[PDB]
Design a protein around this ligand. Sequence first.
Ligand SMILES: Cc1ncsc1-c1ccc(CNC(=O)[C@@H]2C[C@@H](O)CN2C(=O)[C@@H](NC(=O)C2(F)CC2)C(C)(C)C)c(OCCOc2ccc(CN3CCN(c4cc(-c5ccccc5O)nnc4N)CC3)cc2)c1
Ligand code: NA
Ligand code: NA
Ligand code: NA
Ligand code: NA
Lengths: 115, 149, 86, 104
Amino acid sequence: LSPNPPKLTKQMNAIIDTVINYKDSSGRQLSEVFIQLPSRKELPEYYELIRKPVDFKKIKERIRNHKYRSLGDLEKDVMLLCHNAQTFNLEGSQIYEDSIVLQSVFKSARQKIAK
Amino acid sequence: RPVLRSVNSREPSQVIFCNRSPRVVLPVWLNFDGEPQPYPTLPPGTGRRIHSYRGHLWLFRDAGTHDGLLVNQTELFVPSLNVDGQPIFANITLPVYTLKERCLQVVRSLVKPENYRRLDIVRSLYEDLEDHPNVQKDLERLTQERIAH
Amino acid sequence: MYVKLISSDGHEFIVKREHALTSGTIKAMLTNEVNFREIPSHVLSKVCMYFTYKVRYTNSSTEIPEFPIAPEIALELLMAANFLDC
Amino acid sequence: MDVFLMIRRHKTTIFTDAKESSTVFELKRIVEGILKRPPDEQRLYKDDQLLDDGKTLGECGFTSQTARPQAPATVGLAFRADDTFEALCIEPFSSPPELPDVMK
Ligand SMILES: Cc1ncsc1-c1ccc(CNC(=O)[C@@H]2C[C@@H](O)CN2C(=O)[C@@H](NC(=O)C2(F)CC2)C(C)(C)C)c(OCCOc2ccc(CN3CCN(c4cc(-c5ccccc5O)nnc4N)CC3)cc2)c1
Ligand code: NA
Ligand code: NA
Ligand code: NA
Ligand code: NA
């Protein structure tokens, strides 16, 4: 487990920062609830359903520790976060709608920072 | 697992909470283990379309005093599935309190709890004033009612 | 159809039997006249208004208004309500 | 719809309801059913003003907003004796005590 080049870690961090810092037109940070999973004691129901839990804390850690070897590997963990939130909280929940917007903000940020 | 709980249906249900009381309302959700959770408050006359699930148990209190309120003329609210995307409506009102209970509410609202035993009243009413309304009290009563189907 | 409730100062209140029966105490004591040696007129009139309010709004579909109580009658009204079991 | 009244004379208070659309005369008939005095033995008042028999309770100023179950409007009642109407006399209710210090 050897280090990614500096320019790739600079790319990854700037994409995730955009997603995390994104505010909507009302002025609300959509990432807020996605920073940190609830614990298995708080909400066992989440862990009976979701096989591969992940939050933005873990995604920032996986950047620091060079576990993502491509912008592609990063996207997969973010899409997974957003799909887990969609699977658990179903269509019709604010948190499902928030996760959809964040998928879009991610792809939009990676399109700008891969230029 | 207690008698009064939400079930983990994972079946979405759109609900409108409407406060037609002169109280600030605290919606209270019973979780999968019967434990009441507080949700954001509704000022008098306000309503909100909110997302819930089939078989999720709700009840409604004065946000300041925990005085109990009705929803569609009963104490518990449980959504069906929406038929054809129609939201379920929850009409939140005052009950008809007993006069005794309404008098306790007004004295409690005008007198700091330290000063309750400084009022010139029948002494048995000091205990009644201190027995503040709460969800856990009413939860146990509603549970006993359900035990008798 | 109607019963007489008499306050301590000798005010007579003619209310519907069905409305008076809101009071557990009154419901037991019922003849058609009821003498209250310890509830005065400014309290007993307000009790009668609670009876009207209760029968009107119990099991209604119209919005229910708050039953108002002035600070100055609240303590007496409490003791009345406590004695009258309503 | 419904208006909620206290009909008051001397130390007698009748709690009754009626319709906004019902007449002062129909109220006298309610009183006659209770106190066995005929309409022509009754004067009804609102705040010292004599109510005409043919007028509706709504027309006299008794509305759903001013005559509520929890705050009924007052109708004054005076009876005839020896072919003379008494002065309208409503005995006040008792006064509450001084508001205690601990209730502000
Ligand atoms: C505006 C308003 N005025 C008056 S009332 C009101 C209102 C009404 C409703 C609502 C919202 N509706 C509800 O809460 C509904 C009502 C009831 O039916 C339960 N209920 C659920 O949603 C539940 N869900 C379910 O049963 C399922 F989802 C199908 C299985 C449950 C509570 C278990 C969540 C509302 O919202 C305000 C805010 O309300 C909350 C705020 C914070 C918390 C505490 N926790 C909860 C878990 N949580 C999550 C994290 C992640 C995640 C994190 C990191 C990475 C990935 C992730 O996936 N994902 N999902 C989560 N749920 C974090 C916060 C709870 C409520 C206001
Ligand atoms: Na997750
Ligand atoms: Na559920
Ligand atoms: Na839902
Ligand atoms: Na009430």
